[PDB]
Amino acid sequence: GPREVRTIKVFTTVDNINLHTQVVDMSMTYGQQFGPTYLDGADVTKIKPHNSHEGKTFYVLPNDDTLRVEAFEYYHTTDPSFLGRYMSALNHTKKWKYPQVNGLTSIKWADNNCYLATALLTLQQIELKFNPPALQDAYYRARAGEAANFCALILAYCNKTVGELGDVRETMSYLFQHANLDSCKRVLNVVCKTCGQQQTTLKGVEAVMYWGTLSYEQFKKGVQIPCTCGKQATKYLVQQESPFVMMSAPPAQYELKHGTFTCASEYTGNYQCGHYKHITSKETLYCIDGALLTKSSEYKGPITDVFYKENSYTTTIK
Ligand SMILES: [Zn+2]
């Protein structure tokens, strides 16, 4: 008989839904045949096919027309490096633990993931619909307790790697861009005794996010901002249409009072070397810190984001 190649049968994919049958040469690396290749997040680019690999599914980079279409439609990304960064993160997040704390999926602390835990807890408490099929799929999986893919996707979408220190407000900003916030609208009015008044309408992400004040009530009453003429002007909320709002500000000692907010991010410590915790208002106040939970009737600490429920609001200010 003539000398012949040994092969096995595997599937490749970019979305784990459309599987593509491949015959691989056992004498070559996966990289030699597919380019960068991943097995449940593990980089097997330099590995030759094992007999145990037969029938398994491998993730590859979108390097042909079919895979580019499938990656673009599933992930809503134009970045060729997306699949690689996602799988590199999944290799770690699949090893994290995701305890249920107070009825929510949290993350046990690892790899400086405190900002991810507080973001994950927050996402389970505000009404959000993600546009990428990958995010909406992984999110439901996260609510059921299996958050590893959702966490690796958040890292990919935010261009962060495992172990990098993160920021909740920036994370929320990246994710909100992938959310359907089309019916979200905010109308603001800015009043200066000299220059008069000017109204502004904001839609989408800019209608739900605000930087500089934690108190939604204070935003309704009016916040002092500098105006172009050197006098402090007053900016106040005229109309809001959204299922929630997110008020953020530099970490500052702040009292959280039960029933007046949905949840909040505490940041202790110094700039870019501190620690996030999550505070949620249920029947009392719950402080979720990864796997850890404490309860209290009152809470005061260095708060940096507060989330509030909303539906429709219209000022009574003339
Ligand atoms: Zn002015």
Author numbering: -2 to 315
What did the paper state?
M208W performed similarly to wildtype PLpro against each substrate. M208A appeared similarly stable to wildtype PLpro, while M208W strikingly increases the protein melting temperature by over 5 °C, indicating a substantial improvement in thermal stability. We set up parallel crystallization screens with M208A, M208W and wildtype PLpro, all with intact catalytic sites. M208W readily crystallized (in 14/96 conditions), but we were unable to recover diffraction-grade crystals of M208A or wildtype PLpro. After minimal optimization of screening conditions, we collected a 2.00 Å dataset of M208W with space group and unit cell dimensions (P21212; unit cell 58 Å, 85.5 Å, 83 Å, 90°, 90°, 90°) that were unique compared to other PLpro structures in the PDB. The Trp at position 208 had clear electron density and was accommodated without disturbing neighboring residues. Overlay of the M208W structure with PLpro: Ub, PLpro: ISG15 and PLpro:3k structures indicated that this mutation does not introduce steric clashes with ISG15 or 3k. We examined B-factors to determine the extent to which the M208W mutation stabilized local PLpro structure. In contrast, increased stability in M208W PLpro extended along the whole β-sheet of the fingers domain and propagated into the α-helices of the palm domain that pack against this sheet. The area of stabilization encompassed the 3k binding site and may provide a mechanism for improved 3k sensitivity by reducing flexibility without perturbing structure.
Papain-like protease (PLpro) is an attractive drug target for SARS-CoV-2 because it is essential for viral replication, cleaving viral poly-proteins pp1a and pp1ab, and has de-ubiquitylation and de-ISGylation activities, affecting innate immune responses. Based on recent findings and knowledge of SARS-CoV PLpro function, PLpro is an active enzymatic domain of non-structural protein 3 (Nsp3). The PLpro core has a domain architecture that resembles human de-ubiquitinases from the USP family and comprises “thumb”, “palm” and “fingers” domains. The active site residues are found on a flat surface, split among the thumb (Cys111) and palm (His272 and Asp286) domains, while the fingers domain contains a zinc binding site coordinated by Cys189, Cys192, Cys224, and Cys226 that is required for overall structural integrity.
